[PDB]
């Protein structure tokens, strides 16, 4: 709305590697996340196809399409409730203390639903899981929501 | 009808339809007051849901 945030246009100049002021359709998922929006990858996929837009063939972009797609994704930020994130992992391990065994969270984050690479899974556990093999998800989900 | 099955349902419905089994109750809903519902469910499979 501007509140006209012109820093979204300045961040589009940091993600366009050619400097022509266009951003390919394959970068739009990760740049919506870098502007403070977390649409799921199936949602980013649907919307695209919904609009008869093929992410399979070469794509370019213009700021005039990327701005309204970020504004259509911005209504879905009401789905980001931290009660359900901590209660999900609290149902994932027994006893009254928030600890996932290391390999349980790593294999679930790579193979269940939207596949996260094991390189990204190791980069998200690095520091929050110590050598006991127990990830405290009270501080883990706190630090994941700090970015 | 002649079994009694349909009559047991009747008498039930004069009644409490949906009936949740306790663990089946824990798991699915712990998350609602997460701390206090999880403790309840874990601490006593039944007493928990309570």
B31 and A96 in contact by Cβ < 8 A? no
Residue A111 CB coordination number (10 Å): 10
For residue A52, give the DSSP letter: T
Give SS3 for A129.
strand
- Structure-determination technique: cryo-EM
Residues of chain A with C-beta less than 8 angstroms from the C-beta of B27: 91
The dihedral region occupied by A99, where left means phi > 0, alpha psi between -120 and 50, and beta the remainder, is beta
**Could you tell me which residues come within 8 angstroms of residue B38 by beta carbon, excluding any fewer than 6 positions away?**
A87, A90, A91, A96, B26, B30, B48
Shortest distance between the Cα of B18 and any Cα of chain A, in A, equals 23
Q: Do residues A21 and A62 make contact, with C-beta atoms less than 8 angstroms apart?
A: yes
Q: Could you tell me the two tokens for A98?
A: 């928030």
Residue A133 CB coordination number (10 Å): 12
Burial group, residue A136, by CB count within 10 angstroms (0-12, 13-18, 19+): middle
Residues of chain B with C-beta less than 8 angstroms from the C-beta of A91: 27, 30-31, 38
Residues of chain B with C-beta less than 8 angstroms from the C-beta of A95: 42
């Amino acid at each position: 709305s501007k509140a006209a945030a012109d820093d979204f246009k300045e961040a589009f100049l940091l993600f366009d590697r050619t400097g022509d002021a266009k951003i390919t359709a394959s970068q739009v998922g990760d740049i919506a996340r870098a502007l403070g929006q977390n649409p799921t990858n199936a949602e980013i996929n649907k919307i695209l196809g919904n609009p008869s837009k093929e992410e399979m063939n070469a794509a370019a972009i213009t700021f005039e399409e990327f701005l309204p797609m970020l504004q259509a994704a911005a209504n879905n930020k009401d789905q980001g409730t931290f009660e359900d994130f901590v209660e999900g992992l609290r149902v994932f391990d027994k006893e009254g203390n928030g600890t996932v065994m290391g390999a349980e969270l790593r294999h679930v984050l790579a193979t269940l639903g939207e596949k996260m690479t094991e390189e990204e899974v190791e980069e998200l556990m690095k520091g929050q899981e110590d050598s006991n093999g127990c990830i405290n998800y009270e501080a883990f989900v706190k630090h994941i929501m700090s970015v | 009808r002649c079994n009694g099955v349909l009559e047991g349902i009747r008498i039930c419905r004069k009644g409490f339809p949906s009936r949740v089994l306790y663990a089946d109750f824990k798991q699915r809903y712990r998350v609602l007051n997460a701390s206090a519902i999880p403790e309840g469910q874990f601490m006593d499979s039944k007493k928990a849901s309570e």
